Symmetry: D3
Subunit: 260 residues, 6 copies
């Protein structure tokens, strides 16, 4: 319902896309515990909604998210960290079944960068900037900064970025495979919506098998990933939407999915 760190609203034609704007520009959308709490509540209600098929995540023109809130972390001990399982809440984004598109304008550093990488797709603004400056303040990134980055971008660029704290541009991010489309700043959010919209017009149950199938590519060997894929593939033949979509092509007419 009511939110003070973010702005969540349904968007697209037929409102089939849920947009989540991080709205804490004063500290460039720095990711405190209360901010994350609210994104999780927001994600939950969009996951729960039957009309919603794809979620789009963004911040402002200047920043997607500058990073973790450093003023909270400052006095933590080792024991405090391990016992509490600090940054457990931050992983929620990777357990949503419906797909999430990151629309990243301006700065995505540290947590913000890590948040974008947890998403399934990233669209970048022209003046978007990606970095993992943790090393500069005596830590390493602790939310897949080392894992998801390196897998996208390759060892040499990940090592360079993680060990120096250096930033890369949206153009390089695209070239390296971290992001998959570059858009003007003014139309970025809209272009992500139109993509989210396309995905939303496909069957929710099958779309979720697809997403799950693509995430197995980082969790197992190709041989077993192939096998797992074949079983999700076979599974689709137990859905109505799969008979609908395939007989639509053969009849040369428009398909209509009931997410079933």
């Amino acid at each position: 319902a009511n939110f003070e760190y973010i702005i969540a609203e349904k968007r697209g034609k037929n409102n089939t896309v849920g947009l989540i704007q991080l709205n804490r520009p004063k500290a460039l959308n720095a990711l405190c515990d209360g901010l994350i709490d609210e994104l999780n509540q927001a994600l939950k209600i969009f996951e729960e909604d039957p009309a919603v098929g794809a979620i789009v995540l963004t911040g402002g023109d200047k920043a997607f998210a500058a990073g973790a809130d450093i003023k909270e972390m400052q006095n933590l001990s080792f024991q405090d960290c391990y016992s509490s399982k600090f940054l457990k809440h931050w992983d929620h984004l990777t357990q949503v079944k419906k797909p999430v598109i990151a629309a990243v304008n301006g700065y995505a550093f540290g947590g913000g960068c890590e948040l974008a990488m947890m998403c399934d797709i990233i669209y970048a603004g022209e003046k978007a900037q990606f970095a993992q400056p943790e090393i500069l303040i005596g830590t390493i990134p602790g939310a897949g900064g080392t894992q998801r980055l390196t897998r996208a971008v390759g060892k040499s660029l990940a090592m360079e970025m993680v060990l120096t704290g250096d930033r890369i541009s949206a153009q390089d991010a695209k070239q390296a495979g971290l992001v998959s489309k570059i858009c003007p700043v003014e139309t970025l959010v809209e272009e992500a919506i139109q993509c989210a919209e396309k995905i939303a017009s496909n069957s929710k149950i099958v779309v979720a098998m697809a997403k799950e199938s693509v995430n197995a590519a980082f969790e197992m060997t190709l041989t077993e990933g192939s096998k797992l894929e074949k079983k999700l593939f076979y599974s689709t033949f137990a859905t109505d939407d799969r008979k609908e979509g395939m007989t639509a092509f053969v009849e040369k007419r428009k398909a209509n999915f009931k997410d079933q």
Copy 2:
């Protein structure tokens, strides 16, 4: 035998390349059971031919393969699929020990795209297009689409492709690493045959060991992939061609290999 769906021919210098062309242009080379049946026969003849050192696979100038034959899948049940090991036959291509180069002009969609990714090397034409549009017909890619794509191009672009069914250009695929060379439509097939000629000049057995070692990059941690590679490496030192290859270099002369 005598094919109805494909053209299999020896090409290159001294006919050391096996060219398989998918020749079902009325259906945009849609990969029906009968066509894969023949493709697999051609693959087996060239595997057994001591003359042949590498294989190039193509379709027409308009289409490589537009997909699986959606008219055949229309009335499959979940039981039909599981107990038929449906699409298993499509994997014979992954068991070929000689290198296979895919020369993709025009459309390589869905099944067609997957066939391309199973090959060791992909060359694309200027107007080539890749897509996994199974999501539009209410399935997911069921022949490595999600696995090989994601491993080649990174999450963002694979998620966008599989979830929306969108197409990427020849040039989008080169930048992503899905393909390794772009050619003029008119010379693609010849450029691929030249690449196959080179490979064929090398020792078949050490070439087989190299391909096996490269494929292992997706089946193992790096530590064990490194251990596997050494076993193959040391193994080469039991071949006549290794001795000849290194003696050629020391005597400043051309190597003349004997597949042994």
Copy 3:
């Protein structure tokens, strides 16, 4: 000490960067046992040196290294290789805690390419050329040319390089993610040192944990990698530098790391 195959000097402000220059130019820095033996000695004293934070490894302007010494390999048998654990001494470079940057001008072929790929970051000169031509001498890459290359560059290009022995430009290399920056031949080594310089001013302990985390991306599933990253992340909180880094940030001043 007094090496004959290499030069080793401390560089950067306050001699915080170790530079190793392969100096066997008459043989294009071909990696004979003697040379690798000196390389490892030099890595050891830099690794043991508390002033040094980073290591830059380079060759000549014409050649980084043109491969493993083929004359030493020529008369080896299978039994010689296996029992002598041939090439095992090369791996010492993968075991150094501190970051190593390759600065590649000219040829990096076969073992030379493999040596570069074992470093964390690769910087390339505008005329650098990468290749794995082992197949042309009747062997396969035996020091991770099929493992690390594939993981960087993708299957297609890797297969094409490994099976044909063909070379790729510095520009190709960067595009494929094998290298993270290209520079002019003239200033490569100085720009590599500058990168090393930044890294070396960060906490040596947390930097080492950072690197150990990024390398984990090739040794485990993303799930376990994430868990490993967290364990290391929490571990930083037991260090003096991690407090000194964050407190320096908050107070808006220079952090003063004591590598502890």
Copy 4:
């Protein structure tokens, strides 16, 4: 809260053990939503209670848990199962960071057995029986039943148990290492508490890491397990309870752990 399917109470001298007893004897502690929901609340509490060092899970004397509530699963569709993750909340045992010990008297069938296997340590009564009989009612085990059983017991016996639904005694389970102790029915829960009470004596933080390290053995290669273990083994030196544990030993006395 005042539970209706279970009993949850603190036990041992100084009440340092959590005991959860499944109390649905009429249905032979068959697992239904209502029972699982409460078990999960009881785990949550004991995990939060700083006096609780270990948990014991048990049933009655005739039955630990005799399978699941099949009357609930009876009308379910495939879609219903997948969309609404079925048996998701049956998994919180695998997320408790303190050690849980199954104390199995009588039948542990279907989910019963799975529930026991999800625990760290299984103690079995003399007349205890284990089976995965889901095959007989047209399913397969869906709570790690094929996965944890096989890794405990081995392929032959796991395959025999799963494909026939046949039952093994406590004596067979012990031989095969599914359970690690056999006790008289009368004193089973009593032995389980004594074992739990020793575990409760140790440092809560250091016990937690030891647990995570053992669990690692089923999720990584031996190579990386060893690395992970080492890193946790280094972590212990950040804690007071290790400084305290070792200095108590060298001073020849009993140690006072503060779970820190």
Copy 5:
């Protein structure tokens, strides 16, 4: 067909079990290429036969199989082996979707023991002996004898068996978990048939999934193995036999499975 090396017959009440008896006693069922071709033939027709729900593989009373045929392997070079993919044809048994039970009487040495380990369940006779004696003829086991054995029995005993060639008894093997039952010599095969009979009572499709799930235990981390298990579990809710099976339990009657 007209098998010269084996005997294949349907067995059990209702002929729902297929028996394959290796019948080359003059060579102690040594596994020459001819014998394996026929074994593979028999497996295929029992795999295709809809009445057959489980297979039993045996040899004679003196010998299950004494190993790979050492007279055939004698004159093979390294080149021959690698290029001929030697022993690759043995793996077809691992591709059968129906369960296979090895009934081992007397000698199961080297390849004999490897073949039995490829089966899903092993029943051993009181006088059976297991060994991997390849080392005493200057090879290692090359059909899973280092891999399955180790996984069943543990490092210490595997290392002992493979490095010395020493044999173990049925009792040793049961203790180690290589075999799940010991039978008298004279009723072993019938006892095995009775295990097959029970397996054949259940739904062939759900049994195929069950078997496929248990095999996954050796190919994945426990985390991925559970998600694969969950997906197969859900898949069963798409079959006739699971509703029938569950509705038959609730109604306290005998289920009638349709393998569907």
Copy 6:
């Protein structure tokens, strides 16, 4: 050299076994640095000695190794363990190419138990006891005692031993697969030497390959485990000893292996 903590000498038929006896009985063979240093020198020597084919490691009748040495460890900080790569030198055992057998009489606790488990084979005297009591002094095992133990013995017993520090008997260890023989105390060492003699009379090169194939069971999936095994299986066909073994068999005579 002139050892002060160990006794090293050649034993067995023709002095082909290398015996390392830990000889610090009054400290129950606690694994201090001086002793591990010497151990490693002794491994290096027997590994280089072409007379030696296998190694037996032991302590005295009352103790194999009571563990590590808390005095050394008492003041270690977190930073000092990580920076100094603590217990790195304790791993050299896992890098010997020749087989190592442990002959464990009496106490093998903590570091002593890990040291045993690092060996290929464990033989235990009738009064042997195994334990991992690190938890009682506030650490976890740091030398694979959470990893090798769990793989050998199963989760329940592993969790029990590590979380309580409780001993198990020699008889319990064999039941669980941690050790492969139990011997009378007085003849233990001689039985281990007999087992070593057998190994030493086989081909060293093929023995080493076999040990490698077995060690791989814990480093990859069974699919890739099998492929690695095949590559080693073929490589033996490059050796003289394989031809000699198979020919010996064919000519009804004793093989005479030459280590080649």
